[PDB]
Amino acid sequence: VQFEQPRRCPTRPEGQNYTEGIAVVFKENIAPYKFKATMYYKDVTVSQV
Amino acid sequence: HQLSRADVTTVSTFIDLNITMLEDHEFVPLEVYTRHEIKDSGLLDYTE
Numbered sequence: 535v536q537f538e539q540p541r542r543c544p545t546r547p548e549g550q551n552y553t554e555g556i557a558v559v560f561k562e563n564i565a566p567y568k569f570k571a572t573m574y575y576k577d578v579t580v581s582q583v
Numbered sequence: 584h585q586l587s588r589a590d591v592t593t594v595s596t597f598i599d600l601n602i603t604m605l606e607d608h609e610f611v612p613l614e615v616y617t618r619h620e621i622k623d624s625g626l627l628d629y630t631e
Binding site (some may be wrong): 561564565566 | 615616620621623624626
C-alpha cells in the first residue's frame, strides 16, 4: 500500500461583479389626480305653509 | 556574532484561513403604500 498524493484544492470563486449606480424606483400610481374647482349654484327653497 | 530573528528569512508551516464576521445590518421600515395612501386611493370618502 501507498499514500494518496495531494488532492487538487478548491478555489475561491471569482466573486460577483457589481456596477455602482443611482436608482429611482417607481411604483404603480394609486393616488387620484387632484385639482381645484369652484361650484356656483343657487339653493332654491319653496315653502308651502 | 549574534543576530536577530528578523535577519533570517521566514517560511511558514501554517495554513492560512481568513474568517471575517458578518457585519451588522439595519433594516429600516419600508412599505410600498402606507395606510394613508391606501385610504386616499378612493375617489370619494363617504365620511368626509
